[PDB]
Each structure stands twice: as C-alpha cells, then as structure tokens.
Amino acid sequence: MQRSPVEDANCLSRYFFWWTNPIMRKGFKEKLRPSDVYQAPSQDAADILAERLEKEWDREVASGKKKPSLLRAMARCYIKPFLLFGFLLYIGEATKTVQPQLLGRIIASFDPAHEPERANGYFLAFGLGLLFTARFLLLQPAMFGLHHLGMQIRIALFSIIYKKTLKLSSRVLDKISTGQLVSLMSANLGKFDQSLGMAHFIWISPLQCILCTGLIWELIDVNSFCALAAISLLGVLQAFLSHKMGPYKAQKVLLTNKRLALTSEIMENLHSVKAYGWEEIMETLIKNIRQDEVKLTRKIGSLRYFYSSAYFFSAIFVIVAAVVPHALSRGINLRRIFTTLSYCMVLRMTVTRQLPGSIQMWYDTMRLIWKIEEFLSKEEYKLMEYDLSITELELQDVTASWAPVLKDISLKLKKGEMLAVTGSMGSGKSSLLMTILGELVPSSGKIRHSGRISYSSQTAWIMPGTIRDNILFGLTYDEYRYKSVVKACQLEEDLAALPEKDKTPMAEGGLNLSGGQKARVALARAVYRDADLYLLDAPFTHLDIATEKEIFDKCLCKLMASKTRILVTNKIEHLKRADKILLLHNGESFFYGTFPELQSERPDFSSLLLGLEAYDNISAERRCSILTETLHRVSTTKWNTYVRYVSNNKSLLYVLIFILFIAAIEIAGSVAGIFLITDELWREEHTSSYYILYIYVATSESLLAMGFFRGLPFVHTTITISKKLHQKMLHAVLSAPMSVLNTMKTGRIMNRFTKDMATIDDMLPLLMFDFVQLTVVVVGCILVVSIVRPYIFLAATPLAIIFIVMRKYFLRTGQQLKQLETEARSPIFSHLIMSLKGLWTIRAFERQAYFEALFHKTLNTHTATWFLYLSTLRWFLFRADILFVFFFTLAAWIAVGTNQDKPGEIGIIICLAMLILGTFQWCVATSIAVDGMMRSVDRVFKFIDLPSESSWPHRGQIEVRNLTVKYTEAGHAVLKNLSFSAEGRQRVGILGRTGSGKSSLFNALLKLVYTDGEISIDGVNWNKMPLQKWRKAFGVVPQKVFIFTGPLRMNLDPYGCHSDEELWRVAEEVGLKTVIEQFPDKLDFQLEYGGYVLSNGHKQLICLARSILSGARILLLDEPSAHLDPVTIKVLKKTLRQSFSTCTILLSEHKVEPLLECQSFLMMDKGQVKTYDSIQKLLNETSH
Ligand SMILES: CCCCCCCCCC
Ligand SMILES: CCCCCCCCCC
C-alpha cells in the first residue's frame, strides 16, 4: 500500500541503516498509528516463503522411503545463507585472540630501564583500535542476518501446518487436543526467532577454547588445567543451584493459580459482593493465601542472587589461582601476567556466557521439529468424489462406526423428491448426514451420489463482516434470487429494521444480532445456493408457530420442492406432508415409509404416536423427549514513575546510602594503589611484595562486585514493594464507584493481575540488580582511569551527553513501535480459533483457497511491523558500539602522550579499559529491557489513582418521594421524581413497561448508580448511616446467586462469629436442615466451582437464610419464577409467611398469577405512578 524504501536502497545505506531517518523523526514529534507503518519487503512474503518449502518437502515425500524429516527438507535450501554468516561469526570472534599480544608490546615498550618508546607506544595502540573496530563491522551484519533468517523460517512453518490443519481425517480430530494445536504456534513467535542467532556457537566455542588453552603458555607448568578446573567448579556450583530451584517452583505454580482462579470468581459477580457489602473478608482471605507465595518467592529470590553473583567473583578467583602457582619458580614478570590475564577472561566468558545458550536451543528446536514431523504424518481428509451425472443417491445395507453407530441402512432415493428422517436424541440423528457429506467414512456397504451437494449445519457461525458476505459467500449478486430468498427466509422485518440494511457490520457472535437472526442467515446460504442435493440438520430450534409454517409453506413448496430435499425435524404436519419418512433405533432401522403404510404395520404405534392432540404448539425439547420416550416405550516513560516506585519502601533508600560509600572508598584505594604501589613492583626484581594486590586492582568487575553483607538486602527490600503495591490496587478497584468501573467490561482488569502483576512480582526485582550492579562497575572503572589522566573528562563528557540523548531518541519511537507487534499478534490466533469451528462447513462450499489466502495477509501485517522494529534496534546498538571506540582510542591516544615522565601507570589504563567492552554492551542491553518493563508498573498506578467513596425502633416503612436517577438509561423508563405511599410491614408488588429496566430500580435503592432525592429510614437519612450501614438493610436474592469455593461455614458466615445452634436453628426455620442432613460433617462440607452440583431451588433458600444471618428490615425479589416449580412454590409461599411477618418485600413480575398474592401493585411509567389495594381498583389498569 505505502511502498517500502528498502526496495529502493543503496548498498551503503542498507548496511548502516540510512532509511529509518524519517520514521525515527515522525515518532519523536507525533504518535504513530497502524496506517503509518508500511509493508514488508518483496523477498519476505509468505506466499514466496511457503511455496518453496512445500516443493522441497514434496521431494522428500515423493521419494517415498524410510521416513521424511523436515530438518533434512529445509537443508535442501536454507544452507546458502546459513553458512555464509557462519564464517563471519568465527572470523569476527577470532580477532579477540590477537588483542593480548599487542597489549604486551606496550608493556614491553615501557619500563624503568630504557627510554619511553613513543612510536610503537602510539602506533601499536592505534593498531589495536583497528582490530577493535574490525570486530564490530564483521559481527554486526551476520548477527542481524540470522534474525532475518529465523523470521523467514517460521513464516513458512506456520503456513505449512495451516495448509494441513484445514484438511485432516475427522476421526482423529476428536483424539487430538485443542491446547496442543494453539500453544505450539503461540509459544514460538518472539522467542524462536531471536533464539536462532546463537546456534552457530556450538562449534565456535570448542574451536576457540582448544585454540586458546593451547595458546596459553607454561604448558610444562600443569596449571592451565587447574585454570580450566576453576571454570569447571564454577559450572558445578551453578548447576547445584538449578536443582535446588525446581522444588520451590512446583510449590509456587500450584499456589498462584488458587488466587488467580478465585479473583476470576470474585470480580465477575462484583455487584452482589457490594450488595451484601463485605470488602473486609475478601482482602484478608487473599492476604492469607498470599503469605506462602511471598515466603516462597523470597526463598527463591535470595537463592538466585548467588547464581548471578558467582560470575562476578569468578574473575579474581580464576586469575589468581592461574598465576600464583607460576609465582613459585620462574621469578616474576609483568608482561608475562598481563597477557595470561587477557587470554583467561576470553575463555572465562565464552564457556559460561553463551555455551549454555547454544546447547539450550538444539534441545528445544529439534524437540519441536519432532512434533511437526508427527503432526504431518497424521491421516488426511479423502477428497470429494462427486464428479458425476449418471444418477442420484441410493444406499444398500450401509454400516458405520465413530455397537456400530449405523447398522445396515437401506434407501433407494429417487430424484427430485421430498424426504424426512427423525428419532431419539441419539439414535443416528446427526451421523447419517455426515456419511452422505463424506465427513465420516462408511465401514462397509455401497453409497454413491452424483453431482454437487449442499449443506446447512446444526450450530451456525458467522464470518465477521457484512451480512451479504455470509449469505452470498463466494458468489455473484443478482436481481430476483437474492430478493425472493431473503423474502422467503423471514428477514423482511430485519430488512427495514436495521440502519445500514444489507451493509450492517457483524462480529464476535450473537451479541449484535439474535440467535433467531443467526439461524435465518445460516439457512440463507443453502437456500441461496444452487446444488443437486440439499441437506439441513435441525434448522428449527426456535418454537415459532408462524415462522415454521410460513417458511415451510412459502419457500419450499413454491421454490425448492422441484428439487430433492432431506430434513430432520419433529412436526406431524411435516411428517404427513413428506413423501418418504424414516425412523431409527440406535443404528438399526425402526421403520421407513408413510402413515397409511404404517397403519398396515404398527396400528398401536400409529394411534399412540398421534395421541397428542395439540402437538404443533409443544416445545421442541419437550416433543423431542416425548418422541424419544414413546418410540422406545412401544418398541511515554517519565521521571516520576521511578520516584513513586522507590517512595514506597524507605529501606530501598536506606540500603542505597552505604552501597555508594563502598564505591568511593574502593575507588580511592585503587587510585592510591595505582599511584603508590607500581614503583616498588619494578624495583622488586631490579619476595612476593605487592603483586597479588596489583592483580586485584586490574579486575574492575570483581573489585566493585556486591557480596552478601553489601548486596543481599536489595533483594529483600524490593520484593516487599510488590507485596504492598498489590494491596493498593486490589483495595482501590474493590472500593470504587460503579460508573467509570462499568465501561471496561472485565476483559482488562483480570489482564493486569494475570500478566502485569506477575512480571513486577517475579521478573523485575532480580532484573533490577543487574542494572544497579553493572552501572557501578562501568562508572567506578572510568573514574579510576580518569583521576590519573585529568584530560579524559573532556573526552568522556560529550560522549555521555550524546549517549543519553541517543537513548531518549530511540525509546520514544521504539516503545510506540513495539506495542504494534503485540497488538498485531492477536488477529493470528483469532483467525485460527474461528476457522476450526466451521471445519465441516468450510469444505462443503469448497472455500479453502479464500481462507488460505486471507490467512497470509494477517501474517504480512505482523512481519512488516516486526521487521521495522528489529532493524531500528540494530541501528541504536551499532551507533552506540562505535561511540565506544572513540572513547577507547581518544583515551589511549592521549594517555601515552601525557605530561608524565613515569609511564608505568599506562599498564593499568589500557588493560583495565579493554575488559569493559563485554560489560558495556551487556549493560546497555538490559537498559532497554528495564525501561520497557517500567511501562508495565505505570498501568497499576493508573488503577490505584481511580476514585473512591444505627438501630431500627421495630420499624420498616419505605416511601421515597422525589427520586430521580442519574444513569440516564433504564429500558426507556428512567426514574424521575418517583414516589409511592406503601405502608410498613406490608408485602408489595411492582410493574411497568415490558422491559423497563427491572434491575435498575433495585440497584438505584442499593446505590450502584448516580441518585437524587433524600432517602430516609422512617426519618433517618444516610447522614448518620454510611454506605455499609445502609447496605445492612436490603435482602437481595437475584437470578444469578453468588457461591464461591470453600465450605458452607465460610459461605454463610464470612466474619465467623455465629454459633452452631444458631446456624442450625435458622436453617430449620428457613427449611434447609433435612435436605442438608444427607451431606457429611454437619455444615463443614466443602463446595467448589460455584456450587453447580447442588440443587437449583435450594440455591435461593441458602441466600434467603443469609438475610436472617445478615439483618432484618427489607427484602427484594428479581423474578424467581424461572427457578421455581409446583412443589417448591408452595413451601416458598408458606414458609415465607411463617418466617417473617415483619420485613417488607418487593416483587417485580410480568405474569398475572403473582398479582393475586400481594397487597398493592405499582403501574409505573416515566413520571407516572399508580396503585390501589382492593381488586376492583388494583386490577382495573392491569386487567386487559
Ligand atoms: C552482504 C555481506 C556484506 C559483508 C560486509 C563485510 C565487510 C568487511 C569489512 C572488513
Ligand atoms: C534514566 C537514567 C538512565 C541512566 C543511564 C546511565 C548510562 C550511563 C552509561 C555510561
């Protein structure tokens, strides 16, 4: 669409990345959008990437022998780029070995004997810088290349699995699990692609290690093996911790679910939780189960410190133990040490840093490739063989299995004729169609149908978009057909009713349009479609006496009756209309024919089936069950967000005060040592003396590293902040007003607790320690180098000031550019999940290519987004790395050319600078990862900032005059100036418009929306009684009652100050004792999963009890009739009378039978009220 600039790029511009400049600019000025970002390169296109690998895999399957392997397939054409970069990494890393030798010459140039050699001093230091630059230029493009290759791989690899998953055998589909299919492709996107770049190291590290170890001198002195053994013992020490981690993870991962599932319960039914008015027990209950999670997290975190720390303390341990044996014999020499130190730390890093990460990958990627290899071996859908036009379908003793599901069906169906089939709920209801379609395979028999076959399924689904797109669905628009079909489908009302008419957008499911309208548009496909055979499967789920006979009489008889039809339904009129009928019995045939023939077969069945007089008006589920019975019967980051994070725990400030002090002391001592010691070292030869300290001065990483007394409290003080910061959120969301809380719709609140809270709790505290640690090493190093050579400050100050500005520049565009990846990620799954549910239908209209094509475009958007980001980072790293060699070369070039006669201080300056490069890249690398994570905590603060909020003298009257709500929506019957004169201790009823916001009137009194007018308790305003004291009054018992996981003791009594006799005596008076007697442990029995296993009717009684436990003034009723029945209604009626006779009741009911019971009934419309006691005055308005 937008046309990408890399297409029209120059070899230099593409190498250094000149093309990002405008997109770098834009993002700094104005915020970016999906329309602004532009497409991927023509090379990187999913059609081109997949189609190649298809051919090369096809070759492996074509040569049909042994067992094809995708690794061997991909190898047929992915090596040419892989081995091209392969050398670049090796030659790019091999330059590191040369650096020691050139350092040694500078130590060889300078000593108290002989004059200070200038020429070599300068030109060899510069000559080092040449190699030092050369390392980057060769490594950078290769490193960036492998990411491009890794990205290029999986783009094909999702296409090749998707091609298969659209067409498999249907039997195996209900063997294979849903989570395995999704999670396999969900896990790979971010991790796999980035991970591929370090695979090469598997042979790089050994090839260097063997060369380095051999290149180390003192081969006669068997101590380089001891120096290797020092690296071995480090590996043992680390691995020992990895075993001790696992036991604690299993304890945490089990616990973390308990709160996460419970939060999902409590948050969804919040309206009740507030209506009862708890907010005290729900805190402490969560806090109690949190305790173990905090203890275990702390116990893990403190352990993990040593795993990171050991690497820092290693350098001094390995370096000393390597050299001090050589101290015994062979006197002492300075150029001997420095070279052997430099060679050590290369091998120390390359064995511990990346060698694990290389091996780590090949275990994963191969284990994953195994899963694809298994998956592609799975059995396939047999392609349709309808391509004939001899004669229509005729079967003969056909058997099938999923006790065979079908056993010897026989029907010689003649063309252009009508047919109907039905039976029990099972008994081969939906299966017989699948064999005609070709979804299920016939076990034995002869089935053969000519010409193309249409289909309409049981459960309908809607492709997201236009209505005509669903209806016409890969056809061309025409005059009459569409009109007559849409007219015949009973959508003439829905034609006029909708605003955009045919262009109305639809998505998600059945929220926008109703299940009835879904069932219409479902049928529209097959009715609009042209075919040789028509197959419907239970299209009349709805109980429409008009619609059923309208569409059956008008559409079929007039339009479709010339052509053949099969239908599954339960209507005697349709059965009597049909030419041929068929009845089943669990795979074996009951009978097929017509009622006149049936009268000469089973006259008792003929009569007793017909016995129901008013059969057409019976409910679908009812009459189906009657048939079932009778048949079987008969037969932007900010500076503040850090300040807030530190401001919680003061201990995080009080820990930082003395960890700064140690840096100044340990700097000062090294400055003193470098200045004071050196002269005596040279003077020693011309004893041990002070060489061993002079080693420790050089190892700046291991010098300023943090131990247990100095650094451990940092872990303790940080984790406490995540505990506190949790409380502030949970309390703030729980205690908040229902207005701004109502817009979000719980697809976002849980998301914070699931993902965002876990990353602040788990991944942050540890990750911060690196950022604190590494900065101290680099800052503390440079200053020691600075103090000795004053003019370094002028070299340092511009580069630092540049370096921060670069980061501010990259982050503003980058953070905005990155989120578009995570947004663009979501379509790819949504498109997969939806495609599975219509797998039967999507084949029937041969519409695979359309979806297979549509699938690519959702990838191409994502890969374009990703590719731009990934490069932008590569730029920043490259510019930042080059900016170091300036610092090195300037410092080095000036150092030797100083106003100082004594050059022995150079030996430190150059050596102690060279080692930082490894830490420098590593330090800036985390610097993005921290700053990105800091955006996540900011979301929690936004939630924390969200706004927030005795006796009755034997009385319980209510008459709230002048009540006006301020929600402005209540079923087109909003409360304005409301009033009623109902006496206390009287049962009351209520009515209004059919759909007048029946709920809103209740929660207006409970105060879950904005309200006006005074509301007095018999002359006692809320003035005295706050929101809790008010909510003590009303007894609520809604259609969706609230039960949570735990025992009935905890459900009935949250606070826990009621006696056992008190708990029983209320229960038996409510009428819920003998029903409970059957359960064990009195009332201590546990309930789970919302208490679904228990009975429906008693699930009200438990809440009705809860009110007697709670308080006595007023009760409410939100239409319980749907959850009521003859035996329950009478006890519910009588026990209520015996129980209360004090508190008022309000009952909203659309039915007439509830009107006979109560005293008075309101007939309420917007600004209109009326009610009377006596039946002549009461009923007259609502008589009809
Ligand atoms: C596409 C391959 C380009 C590699 C450039 C290497 C430059 C080496 C200069 C020392
Ligand atoms: C928000 C402050 C970030 C400080 C980064 C310091 C980097 C210094 C590199 C020499």
XYZ file of C-alpha atoms in Angstrom, residues 7-354:
348
model
C 13.282 -1.824 -2.026
C 14.941 1.334 -3.434
C 18.063 1.236 -1.237
C 21.838 1.522 -1.777
C 24.449 -0.999 -0.535
C 25.929 1.522 1.934
C 22.547 2.835 3.094
C 21.240 -0.678 3.806
C 24.456 -1.631 5.695
C 24.428 1.375 8.083
C 20.594 1.851 8.002
C 20.146 5.349 6.453
C 16.473 4.667 5.542
C 14.868 4.837 9.025
C 15.553 8.637 9.340
C 12.010 9.934 8.631
C 10.301 7.235 10.774
C 12.800 7.984 13.531
C 11.790 11.660 13.139
C 7.972 11.271 12.981
C 7.686 9.242 16.207
C 9.570 11.887 18.193
C 7.137 14.604 17.034
C 3.762 12.819 16.766
C 2.437 9.422 17.901
C 2.353 6.555 15.373
C -0.592 4.517 14.021
C -1.146 1.230 12.054
C -1.855 3.239 8.865
C 1.550 4.963 9.109
C 3.705 1.772 9.276
C 4.418 0.087 5.929
C 4.685 -3.343 4.332
C 7.432 -5.973 4.412
C 9.984 -6.488 1.590
C 9.007 -8.416 -1.577
C 11.586 -11.059 -0.558
C 9.784 -11.514 2.782
C 6.343 -12.608 1.508
C 4.520 -15.634 2.965
C 3.397 -16.953 -0.457
C 7.017 -16.999 -1.676
C 8.397 -18.353 1.644
C 5.861 -21.202 1.967
C 5.630 -22.315 -1.692
C 9.379 -23.044 -1.864
C 9.401 -25.247 1.262
C 6.266 -27.036 0.023
C 8.193 -28.137 -3.093
C 11.294 -29.191 -1.127
C 9.193 -31.143 1.400
C 7.233 -32.604 -1.544
C 10.544 -34.017 -2.895
C 11.171 -35.830 0.419
C 7.659 -37.339 0.455
C 7.884 -38.017 -3.340
C 10.950 -40.209 -2.841
C 8.734 -42.420 -0.679
C 11.111 -44.396 1.512
C 12.078 -44.684 5.199
C 10.712 -41.503 6.863
C 10.909 -37.858 5.670
C 12.417 -35.324 8.128
C 11.771 -31.555 7.934
C 15.352 -30.779 9.056
C 16.630 -32.704 6.021
C 13.967 -30.987 3.886
C 14.835 -27.414 4.969
C 18.518 -28.272 4.480
C 17.787 -28.774 0.749
C 17.609 -24.946 0.510
C 18.447 -23.000 3.661
C 22.260 -23.624 3.842
C 23.416 -20.951 1.339
C 22.585 -18.121 3.805
C 23.342 -20.136 6.996
C 26.991 -20.989 6.168
C 27.564 -17.506 4.625
C 27.103 -15.841 8.031
C 28.748 -18.859 9.767
C 32.304 -17.785 8.880
C 31.594 -14.118 9.763
C 30.937 -15.039 13.420
C 34.113 -17.163 13.576
C 36.472 -14.649 11.944
C 34.629 -11.883 13.853
C 35.302 -13.572 17.222
C 38.814 -14.796 16.293
C 40.152 -11.197 16.383
C 39.718 -11.292 20.213
C 42.722 -13.668 20.469
C 45.049 -11.149 18.730
C 44.354 -8.319 21.245
C 46.502 -9.688 24.169
C 49.729 -9.849 22.098
C 49.504 -6.185 21.049
C 48.875 -5.151 24.677
C 52.060 -6.979 25.754
C 54.163 -4.901 23.349
C 53.071 -1.701 25.166
C 54.205 -3.186 28.499
C 57.373 -4.278 26.636
C 57.877 -0.700 25.394
C 57.621 0.872 28.890
C 59.791 0.040 31.932
C 62.212 1.955 34.228
C 65.052 0.573 32.086
C 65.348 2.214 28.631
C 63.617 5.412 27.480
C 59.806 5.508 26.918
C 59.276 4.260 23.333
C 56.915 6.732 21.642
C 56.399 5.490 18.065
C 55.440 1.917 18.953
C 53.581 3.273 22.008
C 51.271 5.358 19.819
C 51.071 3.333 16.617
C 50.519 -0.081 18.295
C 47.779 1.458 20.486
C 46.120 2.800 17.315
C 46.777 -0.538 15.581
C 44.833 -2.214 18.409
C 41.899 0.129 17.666
C 41.915 -1.066 14.039
C 41.272 -4.650 15.208
C 38.909 -3.278 17.867
C 36.762 -1.637 15.156
C 37.151 -4.627 12.794
C 35.453 -6.885 15.371
C 32.131 -4.988 15.093
C 31.874 -4.429 11.327
C 32.189 -8.182 10.632
C 29.989 -9.416 13.527
C 27.049 -6.951 13.309
C 25.695 -7.819 9.805
C 25.872 -11.582 10.462
C 24.074 -11.200 13.800
C 21.313 -9.140 12.153
C 21.218 -11.657 9.284
C 20.362 -14.692 11.423
C 17.340 -12.853 12.890
C 16.144 -12.278 9.333
C 16.684 -15.979 8.523
C 14.939 -17.066 11.742
C 11.989 -14.788 10.933
C 11.977 -16.127 7.363
C 11.760 -19.751 8.629
C 8.667 -19.603 10.857
C 6.664 -17.528 8.319
C 6.855 -20.620 6.098
C 6.490 -23.046 9.017
C 3.067 -21.665 10.116
C 1.856 -21.725 6.503
C 2.810 -25.407 6.029
C 0.979 -26.553 9.229
C -2.083 -24.411 8.369
C -2.378 -25.992 4.888
C -2.611 -29.384 6.629
C -4.896 -28.422 9.546
C -7.614 -27.255 7.087
C -7.834 -30.864 5.758
C -7.358 -33.898 8.042
C -9.365 -37.054 8.785
C -12.308 -36.107 11.052
C -11.943 -39.141 13.382
C -8.506 -38.144 14.686
C -9.709 -34.526 15.259
C -11.545 -35.575 18.483
C -8.453 -37.567 19.559
C -6.149 -34.501 19.169
C -6.386 -31.761 21.850
C -7.155 -28.041 21.284
C -4.473 -26.550 23.591
C -1.644 -28.518 21.933
C -2.519 -27.075 18.491
C -2.727 -23.407 19.616
C 0.063 -23.278 22.249
C 2.643 -24.807 19.854
C 2.295 -21.851 17.439
C 1.663 -19.266 20.204
C 4.893 -20.033 22.134
C 7.247 -19.661 19.131
C 6.800 -16.122 17.669
C 9.022 -13.925 19.858
C 11.409 -16.482 21.360
C 12.303 -18.837 18.463
C 13.124 -16.042 16.006
C 15.527 -14.245 18.393
C 16.981 -17.555 19.680
C 18.249 -18.849 16.283
C 21.171 -16.386 16.066
C 23.327 -18.209 18.662
C 23.020 -21.788 17.269
C 26.359 -21.438 15.394
C 28.296 -21.116 18.675
C 28.016 -24.912 19.272
C 31.203 -25.342 17.145
C 32.648 -21.806 17.614
C 33.169 -22.149 21.393
C 35.036 -25.503 21.344
C 37.179 -24.419 18.366
C 38.220 -21.255 20.234
C 38.577 -22.964 23.648
C 41.019 -25.616 22.342
C 42.994 -22.914 20.466
C 43.104 -20.555 23.486
C 44.075 -23.241 26.041
C 46.890 -24.402 23.754
C 47.890 -20.780 23.094
C 48.328 -20.275 26.865
C 51.984 -20.648 27.957
C 53.517 -22.517 30.936
C 52.389 -25.808 29.299
C 55.150 -27.551 31.303
C 53.682 -25.960 34.460
C 50.464 -28.022 34.777
C 48.208 -25.155 35.923
C 46.180 -24.117 32.837
C 44.358 -27.409 33.552
C 43.827 -26.058 37.093
C 42.661 -22.795 35.457
C 40.186 -24.888 33.428
C 39.215 -26.762 36.632
C 38.401 -23.349 38.168
C 35.895 -22.847 35.299
C 34.600 -26.418 35.886
C 33.973 -25.862 39.629
C 32.001 -22.708 38.718
C 29.777 -24.880 36.487
C 29.318 -27.374 39.345
C 28.484 -24.547 41.797
C 25.884 -23.048 39.426
C 24.284 -26.352 38.365
C 23.895 -27.263 42.079
C 21.531 -24.270 42.461
C 19.471 -25.212 39.342
C 18.479 -28.470 41.107
C 17.586 -26.559 44.310
C 15.269 -24.144 42.364
C 12.795 -26.697 40.915
C 11.259 -27.915 44.224
C 10.143 -24.333 45.061
C 8.657 -23.613 41.594
C 6.222 -26.549 41.987
C 5.021 -25.114 45.324
C 4.536 -21.627 43.805
C 2.931 -22.590 40.443
C 0.254 -24.602 42.329
C -0.463 -21.722 44.763
C -0.506 -18.855 42.211
C -3.476 -20.480 40.410
C -5.628 -20.566 43.588
C -5.737 -16.758 43.895
C -5.885 -16.260 40.087
C -8.971 -18.502 39.751
C -10.573 -17.022 42.903
C -10.052 -13.456 41.578
C -11.908 -14.544 38.397
C -14.850 -15.648 40.591
C -14.976 -12.587 42.877
C -14.529 -9.929 40.154
C -17.229 -11.147 37.730
C -20.011 -11.094 40.358
C -18.921 -7.822 41.999
C -22.441 -6.311 42.045
C -23.505 -8.951 44.588
C -20.287 -8.651 46.674
C -21.014 -4.945 47.121
C -24.782 -5.566 47.559
C -24.022 -7.803 50.566
C -21.306 -5.282 51.419
C -18.241 -7.261 52.502
C -14.863 -5.824 51.241
C -13.181 -6.956 54.524
C -13.096 -10.772 54.351
C -12.175 -10.735 50.624
C -8.986 -8.787 51.481
C -7.747 -10.941 54.398
C -8.685 -14.215 52.642
C -6.486 -13.217 49.657
C -3.759 -11.893 52.014
C -3.713 -15.224 53.905
C -3.092 -17.313 50.749
C -0.592 -14.663 49.520
C 1.675 -15.235 52.590
C 3.016 -18.539 51.230
C 3.545 -17.055 47.738
C 5.611 -14.208 49.278
C 7.640 -16.574 51.515
C 8.380 -18.961 48.628
C 9.215 -16.076 46.220
C 11.608 -14.616 48.829
C 13.157 -18.054 49.401
C 13.719 -18.428 45.619
C 14.951 -14.852 45.049
C 17.599 -14.955 47.798
C 18.913 -18.216 46.288
C 19.065 -16.728 42.761
C 21.430 -13.922 43.917
C 24.378 -16.328 44.274
C 23.797 -17.706 40.739
C 24.380 -14.206 39.314
C 26.994 -13.195 41.942
C 29.356 -16.168 41.378
C 30.134 -14.945 37.834
C 31.399 -11.605 39.248
C 33.528 -13.217 41.987
C 34.896 -15.783 39.478
C 37.358 -13.452 37.681
C 39.620 -12.802 40.697
C 39.393 -16.487 41.747
C 40.372 -17.873 38.318
C 43.039 -15.224 37.567
C 44.852 -15.582 40.931
C 44.802 -19.393 41.066
C 46.100 -19.420 37.461
C 49.192 -17.232 38.054
C 50.306 -17.657 41.702
C 51.478 -21.233 41.069
C 53.750 -19.746 38.372
C 54.913 -17.362 41.109
C 56.551 -20.471 42.616
C 59.652 -20.720 40.419
C 60.386 -18.545 37.350
C 60.814 -15.362 39.486
C 58.364 -12.636 38.413
C 57.488 -10.764 35.202
C 54.879 -8.132 34.278
C 54.416 -8.797 30.540
C 54.041 -12.496 31.442
C 50.991 -11.780 33.670
C 49.010 -9.232 31.626
C 48.896 -11.436 28.501
C 47.813 -14.519 30.518
C 45.077 -12.482 32.257
C 43.679 -11.221 28.931
C 43.654 -14.772 27.482
C 41.852 -16.072 30.597
C 38.813 -13.749 30.614
C 38.016 -14.546 26.951
C 37.753 -18.262 27.805
C 36.024 -17.450 31.119
C 33.246 -15.574 29.289
C 32.814 -17.815 26.198
C 32.424 -21.011 28.323
C 29.909 -19.538 30.843
C 28.054 -16.836 28.843
C 26.878 -18.364 25.529
